[PDB]
């Protein structure tokens, strides 16, 4: 439905690269490359999207996760993005995210960053 | 590593049921059943976890997504949980979550709920 | 310090109006008018800011609260904005916010919206 | 209304101390002492609460801010708590919070922590 609209290469305001395939079943698969933080090269992502969204002009809800471990680095952390895809000439994925680091129990109060990323099809 | 510790059936404070398998590669697969909201029965989830966490007593970072569409209902929304697994006698997964609904652009300011769920191996 | 830079009239991307005075002591006082939601006219706000920020080019941390009760309406809710003031030609206050509604205990999981507002000195 | 219920000394799960007065007009004034982080002794807080909440068993919405500057320390950061007061034998204030640090523009993606604190009248 928005399978075609979501599948592809997206870029956020930080210059990160989100490469995703949307499956007919609601699956999101792909790779993420962050332009910032304790990260290098590509990381696996997986997520889900609403494969039968409302037809009233609403966006398409979706989310995905990256664990920041690959063959190069392990930042002992994971980010989830929660948001919606908005189609059209200037298609966008508007997200908020939560980045949790593994911590000791004494430090768990400072485990989680929150922010917002907007992805577009052009950098 | 925490593959065995994470795999299984978890319950949160709302009485929701999180059934997950942790793969050797960092994958999370399974099903979620919410005790609240516009939800019935099981929904697909997918996520990621740190398969090689720190050995200094830190938790294990992880996250997952549910899109709230199944064969019974479609709530045009997705939730992502971001958190850490803490092993031991009283193992826990401590999370914060973001629930994004598909909205019109005019309503996007009110698209996203935030909360926190704690999962245990016993209800 | 940024007392002069913060004091004044600010506008966000929704067309809301934030009127604030920064005190020498770190106080924020003023009024908020939301262009959206269950709101009309001005609401009291109060908050705090860092009156002696770092001199290394960092922003100035601040926050404020609105309870959505005035002489016209009571939305049984409160929003807090947490963010930083960035000075200069295009001064900005970049925030994330939490909007909590009063709920029953059974509904408390869906009590809190999260979002992000960027304020500028020009609409 | 909940003026009497809110006014007083509260303690969270970290062992922090929140001392507040609720004014008839919806004002919150007081001091905060954090048991964790870059903090020592008391800090000024100000906030707002719904002075005429619903009478249907709903909680009372409120929020407050601390800027982490006092005569002893300056952590160049501010926290806002957004939540609701629930009255009764085991009265509670259930909150989520946003802690923003002043950062450079390049580091603003990692400026804001999110968490949740529950306050009770007994430690």
Swiss-Prot record, chains A, B, C, D:
Q: Which domain of life, per UniProt?
A: Bacteria
Q: What is this protein's name?
A: Streptavidin
The Avidin-like domain, residue ranges: 4-123
UniProt keyword list: Biotin, Secreted, Signal
Q: What is its main location?
A: secreted
Protein function? The biological function of streptavidin is not known. Forms a strong non-covalent specific complex with biotin (one molecule of biotin per subunit of streptavidin).
Q: Does the keyword Lipid metabolism apply?
A: no
Q: Which organism is it from?
A: Streptomyces avidinii
Q: Give any GO molecular function from the UniProt entry.
A: biotin binding
Question: According to the UniProt entry, where does the motif Cell attachment site sit in this chain?
Answer: 48-50
Q: Which family does it belong to?
A: Belongs to the avidin/streptavidin family.
Name a GO CC annotation attached to this entry.
extracellular region
Can you state the subunit structure given in the record? Answer: Homotetramer.
Q: Where does biotin bind?
A: 32, 43, 81, 97, 109
Location comes to:
Secreted
């Amino acid at each position: 439905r928005d399978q075609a609209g979501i599948t592809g290469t997206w870029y956020n305001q930080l210059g990160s690269t989100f490469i995703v395939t949307a499956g007919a079943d609601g699956a999101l698969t792909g790779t993420y490359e962050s332009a910032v933080g304790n990260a290098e090269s590509r990381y696996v992502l997986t997520g889900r999207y609403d494969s039968a969204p409302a037809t009233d002009g609403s966006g398409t809800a979706l989310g995905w996760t990256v664990a920041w471990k690959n063959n190069y680095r392990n930042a002992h952390s994971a980010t989830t993005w929660s948001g919606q895809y908005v189609g059209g000439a200037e298609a966008r994925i508007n997200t908020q995210w939560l980045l949790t680091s593994g911590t000791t129990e004494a430090n768990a109060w400072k485990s989680t960053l929150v922010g917002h990323d907007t992805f577009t099809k052009v950098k």
